[PDB]
DNA sequence: TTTTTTTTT
DNA sequence: TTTTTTTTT
DNA sequence: TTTTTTTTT
DNA sequence: TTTTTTTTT
DNA sequence: TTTTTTTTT
DNA sequence: TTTTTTTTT
DNA sequence: TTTTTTTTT
DNA sequence: TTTTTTTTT
DNA sequence: TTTTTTTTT
């Protein structure tokens, strides 16, 4: 069964939602189990249309990888990072859409700006959702992401009984 | 059932793979359970033959102990460590093979070099696999290794229901 | 009567013009006066076509709000800020055009770069005008903007005779 | 005769190639020689399609000017710069295409990120190639660019025999 | 044949041009070659009449000596120097014209001011051309001047084949 | 014609020799010229048999690449680097021989230790030549290597006449 | 043909002259070329007899070696060095003449003192020429010496066409 | 003898 | 047009 | 008893 | 394949 | 008397 | 042309 | 909907 | 394909 | 006139 327990932050111009997507496994003929498709921490961004109302139809997704999560949780208060993704990588229609996620601290040190840029050369679109993240909110993510990290890696299968 | 969920890092001249090996337990006649063989975090190194293709036949293994993992996760950005192992320790043919694993930070501080040296006085061989590890990648290990530590120790058996 | 006294800075690839737009007031039936539409400090950017000649047809506007002006005048030499606007906010055709104004100090500390990015998903356009601003020129703005701040707020109506 | 000796750096998502383009000279009627068209250090970027294979058809070029090279070679480890170009400057169809090249140090100080953004308002395209440059690789450029600087300026014509 | 490849910087009130003048040599009767007249790095300054148009008729020249170039290239960002010349030195009409070239860093550290003062007691004139020089532009000079230094000294004649 | 002008340093237990190996070029059918095989700075090490006499028969070679030279010349007094090579890389008999060159500063700061380790799993040999390099001697290399860098890259073909 | 392009500094009690002496080569029977006699940067000192007139008959020479030049160019403003030479080294009449060249910074940091001591136990003479060298003058040497270094080493023979 | 490879003209 | 001069081969 | 609300599957 | 060993229930 | 010029309404 | 909205007199 | 790929049991 | 332009001999 | 020597092709 699917599970919907998003950690969501709602703000001025956009909302930010984060929830883990588990790995898929293939049961070998040997009898063992082998991790197939990798888990991620899925990020969802969507725009605020009107006053404290958001347009879920206009959402964009960004899939944090094991490493990227590893990079996010280890950031100092002064650090910043930026990830670049091609949704249709290695496939017939690559280079067409380009996503970038950036985490920069703000001046005050009262947290970060997390923004998702999406450039689409097929539909000729340019989207950008930025959400402010307090120290407290980002602490939730770091702790929740750390917790989730071994699971998206499939390391929660290694258990004594 | 066996489980295959390796955290793997692929790089220039070698690849590095890490996955936990659980402890074995013996069920006492008393009724209780006693930890027998200890768990480890197994490290696998193997060479890159050709372009982004690796020779799995030429792999070497190194078994991180509870303590060694404890040493690895507590390293500062400036720290370095080195472990020495004899695969055939206390056995009939010891001193013949000698493994050493070293973790040194690189100049930049952009992570570490993790190399596995293997000297074999029987086969008269000398092998060395070095893999670069970004801050993000090493953060995955620290978090994944911390998670795994209580399990390889068998402490995950201590649970309320 | 309208008044045209722009503070303008002309430079390599673009020109920058700044002038206040007063608030509108509605005369209450009570007899008093009530501020209706808010004042702004209007910014105009336009491109340099040819040698020291500029294409006024290609201008883009950005309306500084009371707060944003407040943010601009209080910047240290090392500080930087960025504002995001949707011209057609809360209206039928929002999210389509997106403006961002950024003020970053340059390396030397010899002032700032003020750039106006305009992304238009209807016309499928992407515009960007950057103008260098010396310490002296930015001092004009800070002082002129401070002077203008109470007026765009309508606080100049509070006067003893 | 033309000469093809590119210094090239191949990386994850794009490759970076640098080679000098000499100045052109016009032989005066006086008998002397006069530099006509200026030399540049040409930069080529192109995308990685598939695994360690790159799409040369999708390349973009950026022409470093004497001054820009001068700016690049004098950068400290902590410095960053950004250049803006209009391929069709002063011509009938300007403002349509806009290139920007940025050199920012990365966190670690293990070099820089060199990225080339290309926005095309005619074809309605938005391209961006980023390549990581180690300290060693950037040292090659600085030294190679310094060497090349007097030549693209035409100063190698001033020689005693 | 003469060669015209000036490095030129154009600015508000004046332009600055720099190009090497090679040494002259006298072929000894012994068969060898002897450096006669010394090389210099010639500097040309001229005024801006009208808008981005300059009056080449009003130019003044200043001849950098081996040593002076040596002094210029070794300047720190905070350093400043000043050279004094008498065009008609040791000749019948000396003390009449007096040139001084000064290089002072500007406040910001965004480069230097290079000005050429010319006082002429015969024509009763006093001229002064000041040009601002960015870090990048001055880096061109330092590198170009270093390159040129051995040539104006005639050291480029010392070559193995 | 071949040219033999080695910069050589002779010391206690080994000697160190450095000389550039130019790139090879292929003359295109187009008429142009294309760099084929890359240039290197070749390093030769050999042992001292007896008193100030060396065994040239026991030499080992290490080919510095453009990048590696770039890395060497940019080293601070406190920096250290290490390069790893497989003579028979991508060929039928790879992984068999492994060379490593290390440059570590010595305690005093009176220069560096440059050592070449060679492990040969076919002949079952392990060789190591270490040579001390004063600040002055290493300054020769840095300057000589910088000079040589553009040539091994083939950038000396880009010349105005 | 011989070439005479000395960089000379004239001062109170002595003058200092510096010019490169190229290496000699022997053309092998193999067809190649082999560096025979090494190049040097020759230093000449001579006394000032009378007022700004110098006694060229009383000159003394000192031959800078590749390494010594390497040592000279890498000196900090605070550093000092001293070289010792025996003109008739390894020959029948050694130990008789002893030259020493010293470069010490002066108090102010306004350059260095370069002095050449010559003790001759055959003629029973003791000579000493000291010349002051401004920062600018020493900058000429460093740059001119760096330029000359690859040539006296014979590395200028390694050229692509 | 030499760490290779990626993309053109 | 250009700050010169000092000492050789 | 508990600060709520915003958007899906 | 894996550095082991020490002491219980 | 005053360093000017660039683009509108 | 311009990021809006919230609460009075 | 989601940046992929490399090597086993 | 490439940001241009300004001033000579 | 010049600090030399070490090892090849």
Q: In the sheet that G3-4 helps form, which strands lie side by side, from edge to edge?
A: E25-27, E33-35, G3-4
Q: Which of C120, C144, C103 is nearest to C18 (CA)?
A: C144
- C-alpha A53/C-alpha A55 separation (Å) is 7
* D112-120/D97-105 β-pairing: antiparallel
Sequence-distant (≥ 6) Cβ neighbours of residue A105 within 8 angstroms? A77, A78, A79, A80, A111, A112
**Cβ-nearest to A126 among C79, C81, C119:** C119
Q: Which chains touch B (3 or more CB pairs under 8 A)?
A: A, D, F
- C-alpha B157/C-alpha B154 separation (Å) is 6
Please indicate the experimental technique that yielded this structure: X-ray
Rg over CA atoms, chain F = 17
Contacts 24+ apart (CB under 8 A), F92-100: F93/F122, F94/B49, F95/B47, F95/B49, F95/B55, F95/B58, F95/F121, F96/F120, F96/F121, F96/F122, F97/F121, F97/F122, F98/B126, F98/B128, F99/F60, F99/F62
> Does the CB of C52 sit below 7 A from strand L?
yes
Sequence-distant (≥ 6) Cβ neighbours of residue F57 within 8 angstroms? none
DSSP annotation of D48 reads: B
Contacts 24+ apart (CB under 8 A), E79-84: E79/E105, E80/E104, E80/E105, E80/E112
Angle (deg, nearest 10), helices B135-153 and A66-73:
100
Q: Which of D140, D149, D152, D72 is nearest to D105 (CA)?
A: D72
> Does the CB of C136 sit below 7 A from strand L?
no
Q: Are B47 and B56 in contact (CB under 8 A)?
A: no
Beta-strand (E) ranges in C6-145?
Answer: 7-10, 14-21, 25-27, 33-35, 40-47, 60-64, 81-85, 97-105, 112-120, 125-133
What residues pair up with A116 in beta bridges, in sequence order?
Answer: A101, A129
Chain-chain contact of D158 with E19 (C-beta, under 8 angstroms)? yes
Helix (H, G, I), strand (E, B) or coil at G143: helix
Encoded tokens for A104: 């920069």
**Cβ-nearest to D158 among E137, E143, E148:** E148
Residue located via tokens 């050199």: D103
Chain-chain contact of G137 with E68 (C-beta, under 8 angstroms)? no
Helices (H), B62-134: 66-73
Q: Which of D148, D137, D150, D153 is nearest to D19 (CA)?
A: D148
Q: Report chain E residues whose CB lies below 8 A from the CB of G11.
A: none
F67–chain D Cβ distance below 8 A for any pair: yes
Encoded tokens for G33: 């070329």
**Other beta carbons within 10 Å of C57:** 8
Measure CA to C1' and name the residue nearest I5. G52
- b/e for A77-87, b at 16 or more Cβ within 10 A? eeeebebebbb
Sequence-distant (≥ 6) Cβ neighbours of residue C59 within 8 angstroms? C44, C45, C46
What residues pair up with E158 in beta bridges, in sequence order?
Answer: none
Chain-chain contact of E139 with D73 (C-beta, under 8 angstroms)? yes
Q: Which of B144, B148, B142 is nearest to B77 (CA)?
A: B142
Encoded tokens for C131: 């103008």
- φ and ψ at residue D123, rounded to 5 degrees: -85, -5
Number of residues assigned to chain E: 161
**Cβ-nearest to E32 among G4, G139, G151:** G4
State which fold the F1-161 domain adopts.
Transcriptional Co-activator pc4; Chain A (2.30.31)
- C-alpha C153/C-alpha C35 separation (Å) is 9
Q: CA-CA distances (angstroms) from residue D151 to D40, E158, F35, F87?
A: 9, 20, 19, 36
**Other beta carbons within 10 Å of C66:** 17
> Does the CB of C54 sit below 7 A from strand L?
yes
**Other beta carbons within 10 Å of A28:** 12
Please report, for chain F, the start and end positions of each structural domain, with discontinuous segments joined by +. Answer: 1-161
Q: What is the distance in angstroms measured between the alpha-carbon CA of A132 and the sugar C1' of J4? A: 20
> Does the CB of E112 sit below 7 A from strand I?
no
**Which protein residues have any CB–strand M distance under 7 A?**
A 12-13, 51; C 21, 28, 30, 32, 34, 38, 42, 60-63, 65, 68, 83-87, 89-90, 99
Encoded tokens for G128: 């000493």
Beta-strand (E) ranges in E106-154?
Answer: 112-120, 125-133
Q: Which nucleotide is nearest to B87 (CA to C1')?
A: K3
Per residue, what are the HEC states of D136-152?
A: HHHHHHHHHHHHHHHHH
DSSP annotation of G137 reads: H
Measure CA to C1' and name the residue nearest L8. C56
Q: In the sheet that A14-21 helps form, which strands lie side by side, from edge to edge?
A: A7-10, A14-21, A40-47, A60-64
Chain J footprint bases within 7 A of protein beta carbons: 5-9
Chain-chain contact of E32 with G7 (C-beta, under 8 angstroms)? no
Chain-chain contact of E149 with G144 (C-beta, under 8 angstroms)? yes
Helices (H), F18-105: 66-73
Residue E50, Cα to own-chain centre: how many angstroms?
25
Helix (H, G, I), strand (E, B) or coil at F30: coil
Q: Report chain D residues whose CB lies below 8 A from the CB of E6.
A: 35
Q: Which nucleotide is nearest to G101 (CA to C1')?
A: P3
Mutate to test the interface with D, among C11, C13, C78, C123 (most CBs of D within 10 A): C13
Q: CA-CA distances (angstroms) from residue B70 to B41, B148, F69, F106?
A: 11, 11, 39, 33
Encoded tokens for B80: 């370095």
Q: Is the dihedral of CA F91, F97, F103, F104 positive or negative?
A: positive
> Does the CB of E28 sit below 7 A from strand I?
yes
What residues pair up with C115 in beta bridges, in sequence order?
Answer: C102, C130
Sequence-distant (≥ 6) Cβ neighbours of residue C8 within 8 angstroms? C15, C16, C17, C18
DSSP per position, B16-81? EEEEEEPPPEEE-TTS-EEE-SPPEEEEEEEEB-SSS-B-GGG-EEEEE-HHHHHHHHT--TT--E
Q: Are A88 and A98 in contact (CB under 8 A)?
A: no
Backbone dihedral region of B52: left (phi > 0), alpha (psi from -120 to 50 degrees) or beta? left
Residue located via tokens 């070497």: B60
Q: Are G56 and G46 in contact (CB under 8 A)?
A: yes
F32–chain G Cβ distance below 8 A for any pair: no
Structure resolution in Å? 2.7
Q: Are C98 and C89 in contact (CB under 8 A)?
A: no
G75–chain F Cβ distance below 8 A for any pair: no
Q: Are D42 and D69 in contact (CB under 8 A)?
A: no
- C-alpha B131/C-alpha B102 separation (Å) is 11
Angle (deg, nearest 10), helices F135-153 and D135-153:
60
**Residue B43 half-sphere exposure toward CB, CA atoms < 13 A:** 28
Encoded tokens for D80: 């960053």
Helix (H, G, I), strand (E, B) or coil at G69: helix
């Amino acid at each position: 069964g699917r599970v919907f327990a998003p950690y969501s932050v709602f703000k001025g111009k956009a909302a930010l939602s984060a929830e883990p997507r588990l790995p898929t496994f293939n049961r070998l003929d040997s009898g063992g189990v082998k991790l197939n498709r990798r888990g991620v921490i899925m990020l969802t961004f969507w725009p605020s249309v009107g006053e404290r109302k958001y347009d879920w139809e206009k959402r964009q997704l960004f899939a944090l990888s094991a490493t990227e999560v590893g990079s996010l949780i280890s950031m100092g208060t002064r650090d910043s990072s930026e990830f670049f993704h091609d949704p249709s990588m290695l496939s017939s229609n690559a280079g067409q859409v380009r996503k970038s996620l950036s985490i920069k601290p703000n001046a005050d040190g009262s947290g970060y700006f997390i923004s998702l840029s999406v450039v689409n050369n097929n539909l000729k679109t340019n989207d950008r959702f930025t959400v402010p993240v307090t120290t407290a909110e980002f602490a939730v993510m770091r702790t929740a992401f750390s917790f989730a990290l071994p699971h998206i890696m499939g390391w929660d299968r290694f258990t004594n009984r």
